[PDB]
Structure formats: structure tokens, C-alpha cells
Ligand binder design. Structure first.
Ligand code: HEM
Ligand code: HEM
Ligand SMILES: CNCCCc1cncc(CCc2cc(C)cc(N)n2)c1
Ligand SMILES: CNCCCc1cncc(CCc2cc(C)cc(N)n2)c1
Ligand SMILES: C[C@H](O)[C@H](O)[C@H]1CNc2nc(N)[nH]c(=O)c2N1
Ligand SMILES: C[C@H](O)[C@H](O)[C@H]1CNc2nc(N)[nH]c(=O)c2N1
Ligand SMILES: [Zn+2]
Lengths: 413, 409
């Protein structure tokens, strides 16, 4: 591979120079002959696989603290090496765990919020032994992160994978999501995307309220056991009702959303160690809710209903009636979050901050991996700065990876 | 391997086999993806196997692979390369090659139309005056009084790189750009340099906002010469709004014929360095990019003003509101003037149907998601949710160096 790669901004003419890509550790899925850049998703490590991966991470940590080649550095290496040899695995120090989480976020190419990468409260839940404990740790996460509306980003890390038969898993893909109920007539109530999972909860014993916005319970798996259900205390789930600063009729749509965006289905990889349950959260960019959750056809799909109340011409598509209702819905989303003092950021602010982050990363780190397809907002794309920014995508470690859904793999005891 | 692509909205899965036929790099490796890089990085012995491959897929596509017709054509291309270091395409081959280069154009959302393309063979052109005549005919045919028609004019292939035919204009029709004394820019800022090359060549600029640039035509590696297209061939649209009567007072117009002239058409290892091609506009090209790009006409703030919007915080989404209205006006103007235009909803729908067509009859369709998704309202068009595989099939339209960075005067 070439040593220096250039990326250009076509709006501002700025050329940046990337050396970081040389440290690339995982495969992107692309080859010289084909590009999988728009593809969403393109029994444990042996002692001989683990040695190099650990050292790689440890060297990197001691590099970051300006102690590379130090006595403490070599002692730590020997300690890890002996531990992998005696026990087939090793344990991270707390300092190492905190560094790893922050760097997994820093490396997350699909994330536009990374200017905040170094400000992450890390909760070490590695002493957790049961689902009830997982629940306690998660409720504490939610309340801390929620902070009465002034959200703070956090990750809670449960015990690492051992033999693969003893995984900790949060079965929910996000900590806070709404239920979805298929009707006999074929229509859906709630969030249609969550029907499969809503059905799983009901099977496990959940009593469904069968409403439009029912917060799903947590389905929690400790130490490879069958998962158990818990209801998050309602008072811990901050919610915002959606209203419009001009249209008085918008509140009559009976829409609201949850304040805390928290991903619980991904795998944290640090020094070759696998943290299969590592829920993390930050704060929302408006378009996530206003464009995707609300306007995707497979989601709440409210464009039609909103276009009507707006008295828009809906016969030809070239009136752009769809577009005009999209903007208003996203105005209402940002307006309702700011008025209730819940932290939210619009797609203009967020993309602008990300350009500045990316540049500083090029200046200090020699690169900043980014997935344009995820980075560009799902509306008004070219009037945000990221649209015009060339990006290099590649996969540094530590990282957040995808993993199989647990209901596909769980062995019911 | 047989690769699969999923649409996440409809859950339709398609299976791509066609990708196995490609041999040109895309720029990515297993460890670095350059999916958002705009521009990622011949003799007898080089020229033949390519000639062969192209002749082979031609006779395969007309259902006579290994025919007597096929065999002689191969021997034909043999001797011709052996003795002239090149070869000339049959007419039928030229037409097939052009249509398929459009078909293989990953970045093009309009490809449902690929097989309806009027091919003007201009290979007997020898002078810039010649080229100009050919181009005027192209523009006039393709404009067609508003009922636009896809066309391509193909000039003589490269021979030795020293006698290249080149259209210096990157597009056949574009407005001028003037670097003002006070530091502002008049017209289209994208064109400031090219405009200045024209003025330096004798062009008398009217210094207006929307001045059609003259043609700068290079024939056979010679110095280029200026030609103004006759105004009655250049169809333009005044932009007005269906509800906002003040929008006409903005003073905006755009040309009707989108016609890319800076690209290289490659067929059978032959290089057509001058091959302007045109179709018809998708509304967002003008409403979003041309008008609202910060480094282009940059009209967002002005429009938002006339809309009396609150422009103090970005979170009022005032920019978004203005953008939607600008694109409504654009569609409405063209439509009202019986000039062919397509909205990003219609065009994306057509592209998804086209994709399904391709996978069913051809086994795939290379598509560049970064280019296919419109620059506004992305996820409320179907292509946002469509996984697409990108790879490079030939015949293709490629990029080439700007001529002013290579030509020896
Ligand atoms: C602090 C405020 C943050 C903001 C505003 C933000 C912004 C975003 C946005 C808009 C997305 C796209 C999500 C989607 O389309 O589904 C995203 C994805 C993502 N974020 Fe961030 N983010 C934040 C914090 C974090 C944190 C704390 C982490 C991890 C420690 C993180 C890691 C990721 C990852 C891994 C993805 C892609 C997830 C996937 O594949 O579904 N982000 N972020
Ligand atoms: C017939 C109606 C057509 C429509 C609606 C259409 C639509 C589009 C659009 C919106 C773009 C993006 C251009 C940009 O943003 O700069 C594009 C690009 C492109 N089109 Fe099409 N197009 C059409 C016809 C054609 C024809 C006739 C050809 C060739 C014979 C062609 C080949 C290409 C190529 C090579 C690109 C990429 C240009 C570049 O790399 O800058 N298209 N098309
Ligand atoms: C995988 N596609 C489905 C996404 C559904 C979904 C539903 N609720 C919340 C999120 C959160 C995504 C998300 C995560 C984080 C950490 C920050 C942020 N701004 N956004 C995602
Ligand atoms: C390279 N990025 C800037 C392009 C600017 C530019 C200015 N005028 C016309 C075009 C042509 C774009 C274009 C080309 C074709 C063939 C069809 C279509 N609908 N649109 C492009
Ligand atoms: C097919 C395509 O990869 C898919 O729709 C992607 C496009 N870009 C995205 N970008 C973000 N932020 N989130 C998404 O879910 C997607 N989906
Ligand atoms: C950086 C990125 O490649 C560049 O901004 C691209 C993005 N997508 C595009 N898509 C289209 N249709 N036209 C363009 O000029 C661009 N520009
Ligand atoms: Zn790629």
C-alpha cells in the first residue's frame, strides 16, 4: 500500500494527508475489483492468536502515555504474556479498559459525533455475575447518561467472552426502543422494525400494553444463561413529545420520542479481548428521529399524514410535497428537544463539528477513518460540509463490531 | 463468489454475478475503501487482447459467438493492429460500445434509458471548425425544442497522444465566471479559470451573471479555437415559483441541455478523447448543486431572506426550508416550459426498477451509491436503502486530464 494518501474537500479545496491507514487491522470487505462501501454488514481466540493482538494494543497504550519502551511497559507485556500462557486469556487494567473504550469510539468510522471521543464515562461492570446485576448496572447507566436532560456519553462494559458458551448479552439492539405489534389484518402498531423482538419478549412472558409507544423491557443474558426480562423504571426513561413552533396541529399527531440513544448490540474489541455486551450512549442528531424513525416507510411512516395536515398538493411527486413535510417534521423534532432542555444537535452543527474533528485528527493522529455513506445526513445532504469531503474508510482496533443476534445463536438450557 | 445486495426498506435481495467480468481496479483494497474519492488512482501487444474481449462480448450480445462473422472480424483486427498499431470500429460496434459505456456508468442514475441513445459518428472530423459543426448539430438534435433526447457525438480516437481531439469545455453549455476587483465573483465561480482562458483567447465577455461560454475546440492535437454557439440553439429556462411571486424577481435562469464533454470514452482499447454526451436534467443538479453549493451560485441566504425566515440559529433549519422551495420552482419552471426534467423521486424509482431489470437479465448493475443518492432528501428516495455493488465494466466513460495542463501551444 502507498504510504501517504490524499483526501480533498471539493468545497474548500483543502487537501489532507493520511498516514494512519497503514495501521489498518481488519478487512473492509472491498477488494481491488469491487467496492462494498454501501453494504451495511459486509469458538474463541487461541493463545497463539492472542499474543500478538495483546502486545499490539499494549504497545499502543504505552505509546499514548509517553512511556513506550519503559520499564513499566515491558513489565506489563511480560505480565500479559505469562497470563495468556497460564490462563489462555488476560485481564485489562482499568486504565487500559478506559483507553480502549474511548479509542473504539475514536475509531468508529460510521460515527459523526466523535469530536467528543475523549469525554466518555466508562462503567466497569466486569464483576457482574447475573442478569439482575446487569439490570442494576444498566439502570445506573441510563440515569447517569440521561442526567435530567443534559445528556452525558457513557459505556458500561460487562464481562468479556471466555469460551463462547458463557457470553453476556443485551438482547435489545438499543436500550430504549418502542414495541411493534403485527395485527391479523396485516397492519402494524408501534415501531414495525421491532415486531420480531417484541414477539420474543411476549413469548418470554412480557405483558404487552399494545400501544403506539411502549418502551420495551430489557432482555438480559448473563454468563451464557437464558435471558431474563426486566422493566426499566418509567421515571428513568426521559421522553420528549413532538410539537411544532408554528403549526398548532402538530401536537395532535400524538408523537413523542425517547431522549437517550444507546446501542447495546455491538461487540467491543480491545487487545484481542471480546466484550460481547457493552452498551454505549451519547446524544441524538435530529435527523435520526425526524428523517429515519419518523419517515422511513418501514418505520412510523408519517409523511402522508403530515402532508395532509399541511394542505400540500400530493398528486405529482414534483410538487416535492414529501420534501416539504420532511423539513417541518425535523424542525418540530429539534424544537421539542430544545424546549424541554434535552440535549440534541442538528445536522448542520454536527457535520460542521465533525469536519473540524477530522482535520485535527489528520493534524495530530495522521488520519481519521470515516464512512461517507453513514456520515452524510439522510436529508439536505449537499448543504452540509461532509458531502463535499473526501473520506478514507478503514478499520482500526480497538473497535465496535457487529455480532450475531443472540436469539439466532442462544442454546436454550 | 456470488454476491448479494439487500434493499433494507423492501427486503428484496438480488444476486450479483456480473462483477466477475471486470478487470479494471476500483481503487479500494481489502483494508482501505476509497468509495468517496472523486478521482481514485497503448501498443500492439496491449491493444489486441482488449480488442478481442470487446469483439467477443459484441458477438456474444448479438447471439453469434464463434460465427464466421466473428472469426473474420478477429483476423481483421489482427492485421490492422499489426500494421497500423491501432484499428477502426465498425459502425454497429461503435453504437454498441457507446450504449454500453452509458450502461456501465456507475455514477449515473439515468440508466433506465441506456439503450435509447442517438449516436453521431464524427470520426471523419479533421478540424475545430468541423467539430463545432458536429457539436451544433448535436445540441440542436438533442435539445429538440424542449423534448430532449439522449445523444453522443464521437470524434476521432487517440493515435499517439500528440494529435488528440479535445473539447476544452468540461460541459457543452455553462455560464461564465468573473473574478471581481472587490473580491466577489460574478456568475458561476466554478468556471472562473476557464472563462479567463476564453477571454485570454479573444472572447469578449458581457460580464453578466448568465453568459453562455463559447466553445473551445481542439482538433488533432492542434491549438484550440473559439466558437460561439448560435443563441437559438441554446435553450434556457427562467426560474419562477408557483406560489412565491417574488421568486421571478431573483433573476435566475439555467440552460436546458446537460452535456458532458470532458470525458474519455474507451471501447476495445480505443480512446475517444472527444465524445460529448447529453441527456436531460434531474432537478436537484440545478436546485441543490448549481444554485446552493457554497462554491457555486450560493443563493440560499438570498432566498431565505425573501422567505422571511429566522436565520440566527442553524437549528431552525432555515437552509433546508429554502432549499426545498428552490427545487420546487426549478421543476415547475421546466415543466411549465415543456422542457424535459425529472424529479429526484421519479428518477430514483426508475433507477431501482432499472437495477432489478439488470440483475434479472444481466446478473448485476454496478452502481455508485455516493453518486446515485440525490444531494437532498436522501433517505426518502428508494436508492438510499438500496445496497449497491460498485465495479468497473468496459466500455466505460473515464476521466482525463484537463487539456490546459498538458497542451504544448
Ligand atoms: C455523544 C453524542 C453522539 C452523537 C451526536 C453521535 C452521532 C451519531 C450518529 C448520528 C450516528 C448514526 C446512527 C444511525 O444512523 O443509526 C452514530 C452512529 C454510531 N456511533 Fe455515534 N454519536 C454519539 C456518541 C457515540 C458514542 C458515545 C459512541 C461509542 C462509545 C458512538 C459510537 C457509534 C457507533 C459505533 C455508530 C454506528 C452504529 C451502527 O453501526 O449502527 N457514538 N453516531
Ligand atoms: C437521459 C437522461 C439522464 C439522466 C436523467 C441522467 C442523470 C444523471 C445525474 C443526475 C448525474 C450526476 C451528474 C453530476 O452530479 O455531476 C449523472 C451522471 C453521469 N451520467 Fe447520466 N443522466 C442521463 C443521461 C446520460 C447519458 C446519455 C450518458 C452517456 C451517454 C450518461 C452518462 C453519465 C456519466 C458518465 C455520469 C458521471 C459523470 C461524472 O463522472 O461527472 N448519462 N447522470
Ligand atoms: C441499525 N439501524 C437501526 C437504528 C435504530 C436506532 C434506534 N434508536 C436509537 C439508535 C441510536 C443510534 C445512535 C447511537 C449513539 C451512541 C448516538 C447516536 N446519536 N445515535 C438507533
Ligand atoms: C463535475 N461536477 C460538476 C458538474 C457541473 C455540471 C454543469 N453542467 C452540466 C453538467 C452535466 C451533468 C449531467 C450530465 C448528463 C449526461 C446528464 C445529466 N442529467 N446531467 C454538470
Ligand atoms: C444501503 C445503505 O448502505 C443503507 O441504507 C445505509 C445508508 N446510509 C446510512 N447512514 C446512516 N447514518 N444510517 C443508516 O442506517 C444508513 N443506512
Ligand atoms: C466527496 C464526494 O465524493 C463528492 O462530494 C461527491 C459526493 N456525491 C456526489 N454525487 C453526485 N451526483 N455528484 C457529485 O458531484 C458528487 N460529489
Ligand atoms: Zn470500497
Amino acid at each position: 500500500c502507498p504510504r501517504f494518501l490524499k483526501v480533498k474537500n471539493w468545497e474548500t479545496e483543502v487537501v489532507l494527508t493520511d498516514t494512519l491507514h497503514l495501521k489498518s487491522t481488519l478487512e473492509t470487505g472491498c477488494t481491488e475489483y469491487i467496492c462494498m462501501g454501501s453494504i451495511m454488514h459486509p469458538d474463541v481466540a487461541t493463545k497463539d492468536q492472542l499474543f500478538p493482538l495483546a502486545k499490539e494494543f499494549i504497545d499502543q497504550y504505552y505509546s499514548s502515555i509517553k512511556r513506550f519502551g519503559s520499564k513499566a511497559h515491558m513489565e506489563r507485556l511480560e505480565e500479559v504474556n505469562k497470563e495468556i500462557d497460564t490462563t489462555s486469556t488476560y485481564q485489562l487494567k482499568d486504565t487500559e479498559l478506559i483507553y480502549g473504550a474511548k479509542h473504539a469510539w475514536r475509531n468508529a468510522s460510521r460515527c459523526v459525533g466523535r469530536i467528543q471521543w475523549s469525554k466518555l464515562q466508562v462503567f466497569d461492570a466486569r464483576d457482574c455475575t447475573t442478569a439482575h446485576g446487569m439490570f442494576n448496572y444498566i439502570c445506573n447507566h441510563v440515569k447517569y447518561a440521561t442526567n435530567k436532560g443534559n445528556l452525558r456519553s457513557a459505556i458500561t462494559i460487562f464481562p468479556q467472552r471466555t469460551d463462547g458458551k458463557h457470553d453476556f448479552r443485551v438482547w435489545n439492539s438499543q436500550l430504549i426502543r418502542y414495541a411493534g405489534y403485527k395485527q391479523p389484518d396485516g397492519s402494524t402498531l408501534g415501531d414495525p422494525a421491532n415486531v420480531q423482538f417484541t414477539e420474543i419478549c411476549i413469548q418470554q412472558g412480557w405483558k404487552p400494553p399494545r400501544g403506539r409507544f411502549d418502551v420495551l423491557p430489557l432482555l438480559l443474558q448473563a454468563n451464557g444463561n437464558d435471558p431474563e426480562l426486566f422493566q426499566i423504571p418509567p421515571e428513568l426513561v426521559l421522553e420528549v413529545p413532538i410539537r411544532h413552533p408554528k403549526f398548532e396541529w402538530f401536537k395532535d399527531l400524538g408523537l413523542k420520542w425517547y431522549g437517550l440513544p444507546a446501542v447495546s448490540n455491538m461487540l467491543l474489541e480491545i487487545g484481542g479481548l471480546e466484550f460481547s455486551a457493552c452498551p454505549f450512549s451519547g446524544w441524538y442528531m435530529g435527523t435520526e428521529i425526524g428523517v429515519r424513525d419518523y419517515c422511513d416507510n418501514s418505520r412510523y411512516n408519517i409523511l402522508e399524514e403530515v402532508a395532509k395536515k399541511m394542505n400540500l398538493d400530493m398528486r405529482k411527486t414534483s410538487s416535492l410535497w414529501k420534501d416539504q413535510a420532511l423539513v417541518e417534521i425535523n424542525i418540530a423534532v429539534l424544537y421539542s428537544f430544545q424546549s424541554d432542555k434535552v440535549t440534541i444537535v442538528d445536522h448542520h452543527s454536527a457535520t460542521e463539528s465533525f469536519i473540524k474533528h477530522m482535520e485535527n485528527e489528520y493534524r495530530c493522529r495522521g488520519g481519521c477513518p470515516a464512512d461517507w455513506v453513514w456520515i452524510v445526513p439522510p436529508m439536505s445532504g449537499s448543504i452540509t460540509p461532509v458531502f463535499h469531503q473526501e473520506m478514507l474508510n478503514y478499520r482500526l482496533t480497538p473497535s465496535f463490531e457487529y455480532q450475531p443476534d443472540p436469539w439466532n445463536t442462544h442454546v436454550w438450557k
